[PDB]
Symmetry: none
Subunit: 200 residues, 6 copies
């Protein structure tokens, strides 16, 4: 069995990438759900819960500023699939942020893409460590694409036999991640129109 899905589209689920130990990359699937708060809470358990809370608060800024969704009045649940000891996740991970936006908007995410990067409260995608290791993991998982921060493109020390078993997609801003992973359709179009101010 596998803990990640590698093809097709799913709401609320993203293949993130992480590091275990110093340099063993792993695929870290995230699943998010949002519910009415019945003062909403971020609900996460386990080792990576702080990384989850930070990612949800940062994406909440962007969700409030650009889409006007009332995320402070929602409960946001973050699940990491597969509980590994000594995982390090990217702070304010873009995979968690993307999972949340997908779950709130009801727009499926491409499972054939993996991604790593740190989300700023302004919507930027900030550079992270271990990009080569994480790419290799995505290659081993048989993913088709990997999103990485622009500032980490120099940081890909592939191989000669690995370039390219995967498409690398550099990004500087969250709207770019969403263009690359959200299923095409009317809902995606409406959403992207709301981020035009972030582009500007």
């Amino acid at each position: 069995y596998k803990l990640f899905i590698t093809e097709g589209y799913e709401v609320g689920r993203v293949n993130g990438l992480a590091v275990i130990g110093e340099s063993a990359g792993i695929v870290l699937p995230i699943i998010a759900e949002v519910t009415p708060s019945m003062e909403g809470r971020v609900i996460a358990t386990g080792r990576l819960q702080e990384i989850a809370r930070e990612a949800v608060m940062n994406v909440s800024a962007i969700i409030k500023k650009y889409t006007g969704r009332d995320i402070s009045n929602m409960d946001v649940h973050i699940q990491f699939v597969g509980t590994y000891e000594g995982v390090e996740g990217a702070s304010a991970s873009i995979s968690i942020a993307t999972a949340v936006i997908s779950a709130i908007e009801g727009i499926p995410v491409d499972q054939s893409v993996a991604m790593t990067g740190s989300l700023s409260v302004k919507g930027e995608v900030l550079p992270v460590g271990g990009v080569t290791q994480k790419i290799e993991a995505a290659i081993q998982a048989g993913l088709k694409k990997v999103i990485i921060p622009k500032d980490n493109i120099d940081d890909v020390l592939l191989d000669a036999e690995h370039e390219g078993k995967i498409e690398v997609i550099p990004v500087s801003r969250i709207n770019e991640v969403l263009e690359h992973v959200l299923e095409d359709g009317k809902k995606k179009n409406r959403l992207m129109s709301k981020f035009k101010e972030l582009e500007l």
Copy 2:
């Protein structure tokens, strides 16, 4: 004596399956109780407490989204019957989730069924390890049925003399687990009507 019940119906109690060491499967009975919080707490003690907290938070998402029960304002108590060293439980175990739903709704669970699987916050049943070992344990316990994730059906390496001393029931979503284990009646019917949106 036995620590599990193997026939008839009980509110709040589910026969889960776990692994001890690498491959010794065991029946892991779960009992749940929910009380008013008099900001509710998840109360669990011992080695498997994190597995319990994760399962209750994930099922809480589904309970809030689909049934509208105010679980954040309830104390949820999770008990594992029999304290074994070096048990590994399925993350976000479906047995804990089912025990909680049974306890909140007051609908008894079939004790002749055992189950293993990981619950997603979206209501999916995700694949887990050690499925053959866990099935064997249920066979040894003289259970009649075992629920496993769909994605683990290939993972059943039974025997030739063991197929079939037990009915195997593959599942992809939590509402399926509930159809298979909750006592039939008006309360079960009302509950299942609330999950039709999960089916959809």
Copy 3:
């Protein structure tokens, strides 16, 4: 001297039974005290502290559900009298649970009774090991009665000269334990009226 009391009534004190090694039964007196929390804590030290924490959390469910006492806002102190190496106690021991209920309610417990059994969060008394050894210990201690789980009645391999130097009282639920050990009076009557829903 003796570490246990064998006749008369005492608030907060119960003669539990345990096993040391494999089959040496011992009387394990428990004393409990509850104080305002001045977020309450369970306070226990030593080898059996986990058994104590589990028993107090399970009985807390029943105390909240049926009597409405705010036990989350109390400190609960559990003392085991006599510190023996390699004691094994019944998980979620009914003696600890009974000591707590006695201490909160201020209703003395019969010291001439010993008991063993595991408390479920639902209020059931679950079967335990070493029942013959534990009964013998109570006989040697000169106790008059012993409470055991119903499911362990077949498990009493007495002797021919030991049946009966003690009254054996089988139980299935916590309210039965309380009927058999709490001092008769108005406080006991009020309490038992609150458990009628557990009977039902």
Copy 4:
């Protein structure tokens, strides 16, 4: 030199009695200090640290119940004077409990008294072993009085030439120990008034 003081009054210091080997009694002076926690801690090091932690938790119940002092928000330091191999101390020792009450209340303790006994969380003084050996040690140390549990009075196998080189004071409850060892004055009177409910 001597490790114990044998006359006059000192805050926070008590001459306890212990056994080394099987029957060599020794005077075991305890010194306690309490500080604001700046979630308080019990701080003890060495072989007898568990005995110390147990005694402080048990006396904390009584301190919270009867005097209302916030001991969970204090650091409690327990020192044993003289580090002897293979000392056995009375579980939940009344000497440690008395040292703590003296230190919190600022009321000096009579150094001419030694004591042994086990404190229950309810405030009782429970019987202990080796009472003759411990009394002899106090006699050899030239102490004037020794407090022992009531239930151990039969257990004093003195001599004919030793009865009485020391005053024996039997006790059943902690308030009695405090009446016998705390320096007389207004602070002692206030404190004892708070224990009247323990007498009752």
Copy 5:
């Protein structure tokens, strides 16, 4: 070479005295360092590590009570210079305590002084064994002064040719040790003002 410094001032370093075998005194230099804990730890290795842990916990009581320093949130490192087999150190050694206070406060210690004594959690200096042997060692090391507990002044069996090749300074309390060894200045004055309550 020598393992101890015998003149001038150094932060964090104290010449303690110990016994090897039964009566061979030695100078036992201690060096301490305190760091932020980045729940602080006492870090000590080797044979005397328990003596070190005890001394640091006892001086921590005094540091918290009188100076208000948050020592529970500091890592305290204790080093013994020269690793000798079968050293016995004074329990809760005043040299370790002084090294810690010097290191936290940044106030140098006189290397021309050696000291021995046991620190109580109340700030007293308690008597210790082998005082003559330890004094002789300080004499052989060419130290100028030696601090000993008051109660050990009778215990100095010098010689006729050794009285006095060294100044003996008797002490009853820790503030006296600090008056005698800390470098004079504004920092020492501030510190000593905080101990006036210990004098009282």
Copy 6:
């Protein structure tokens, strides 16, 4: 073959010097590795493991105080190359400390240097025994430089034909050792800037 490298630069590896028997000096190469702790451990095996544990704890103080690295959350592995009977190593050896700093910082060490000395928790280099024997060993190994404690410069009883087949470098503090052995570059410069407070 040789167990030590005598020219060029290597991360994590240092040529220390030790004594076998009374006066046979040997080159004692140390290799260190640091890993995330996945509460870190010092991992060392064999005869010199205590010397290794002491050196790592002392250098940890300096690493925490001056560079802010979280070494308590790292596993530190210390290997001694060549297992000789009856080696004596310098307590808190500066070679082990240097190997650790090199491994954490990723800055190679000059293999043409050997060193001996004891590290204080304050960062001083303390004198050690057998300096002549150790220097001779480095000469025989064909090393180019040897670092020794300042206080041992009088202790070099070379020869007339041995002065100088090697450069002797006296040191008083750890930052001096690092200036002399770490490969020049930006990483070394950054590190040395953090020790300026140790110089001061």
